[PDB]
Amino acid sequence: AIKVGAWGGNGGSAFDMGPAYRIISVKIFSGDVVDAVDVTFTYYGKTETRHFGGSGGTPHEIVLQEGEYLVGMKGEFGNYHGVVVVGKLGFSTNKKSYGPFGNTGGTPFSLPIAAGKISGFFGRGGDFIDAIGVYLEP
Amino acid sequence: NGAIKVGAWGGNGGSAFDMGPAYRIISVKIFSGDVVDAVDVTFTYYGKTETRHFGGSGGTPHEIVLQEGEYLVGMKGEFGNYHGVVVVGKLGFSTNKKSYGPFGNTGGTPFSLPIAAGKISGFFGRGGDFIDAIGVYLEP
Numbered sequence A: 001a002i003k004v005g006a007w008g009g010n011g012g013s014a015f016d017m018g019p020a021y022r023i024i025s026v027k028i029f030s031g032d033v034v035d036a037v038d039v040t041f042t043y044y045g046k047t048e049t050r051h052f053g054g055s056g057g058t059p060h061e062i063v064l065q066e067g068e069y070l071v072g073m074k075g076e077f078g079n080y081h082g083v084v085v086v087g088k089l090g091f092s093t094n095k096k097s098y099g100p101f102g103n104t105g106g107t108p109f110s111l112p113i114a115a116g117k118i119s120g121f122f123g124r125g126g127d128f129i130d131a132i133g134v135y136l137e138p
Numbered sequence B: 001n002g003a004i005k006v007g008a009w010g011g012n013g014g015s016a017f018d019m020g021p022a023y024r025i026i027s028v029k030i031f032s033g034d035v036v037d038a039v040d041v042t043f044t045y046y047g048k049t050e051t052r053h054f055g056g057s058g059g060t061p062h063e064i065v066l067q068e069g070e071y072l073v074g075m076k077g078e079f080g081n082y083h084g085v086v087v088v089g090k091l092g093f094s095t096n097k098k099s100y101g102p103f104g105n106t107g108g109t110p111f112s113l114p115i116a117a118g119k120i121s122g123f124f125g126r127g128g129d130f131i132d133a134i135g136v137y138l139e140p
C-alpha cells in the first residue's frame, strides 16, 4: 500500500486511518489554521467514522458521490504562534474543487494524482491538524 | 495498468513525455544550470535495458548511480517563471541510502513528495528546451 507525506510539523500524536473501500465525506474544520478533519467511509462492510485533530473552527463538508473521487490535495503548512501546522488545506474531486480552507499562508505543497485516488489519511494530530498524509491506490 | 501516477509539477508548455513504469530505474541523469534542462533515465524495461532522453541539451550532467536494493523514495524541487517560461528550476531526489541534489540555481513556488511507504518507478511530464514539468509513477 502507498503512502505519501506527511506534510506539516511534528506536534501531537500520530494517526493512521488506513485505506478505506471508499471515502464518503470529508469535513474540514478550519479557522486561522486548519484545526481538524472528519472522514466518513465504508470499510469492509462497515460504515465507519473517525475524527482527526482537535475541536472547533467552522466546518465545511465535502460530500463524495458515486463517480466522485478525491483526486488532489493542495495545502500550505506554516508556523502558527509557536507550532508548525497545516495553515490551509484543500481538496479536489474529478467533478469539483474545494477550498482551500484556512487563513495562514506558509510553505505550500500540491499533490495532484494524474492516475489513482486518495483513499486514506495518516498524519499527526494536536489542538490543530499538525500534519496530514495520504494513502494512494489506483 | 493499475498504475499510480502523481504529478506533474511545473509548467504547461512543451511536448509531453511518459516513460511508463520500469522494472528497475538503473540511473538518473539530471542536466541543469540556472534551471533544470533535462533528465536521462536508464532502466530495464521488461527484458531489454533502454535509456530515454527527456528535456534539453544544455547544462552539466548529474549522474545518480543506483545500487542493487537502492530505491528512489523522494522527489522535491521548485518551479518558476524563467524568461517567460515556467519550468522546474530546482529538482532533487532522495534514495533509501543517500540524498542527491538539489540541482539548478533558480527558485520559485516549491513542491515536495516525501514517500512514507513506496517508491518511484518511472517518470512522466513535459519537455522542450528545459523540463517544464516532471511527474512520477508510484509503486510499493
Ligand SMILES: [Zn+2]
Pocket: B040, B053, B054
Ligand atoms: Zn540525453
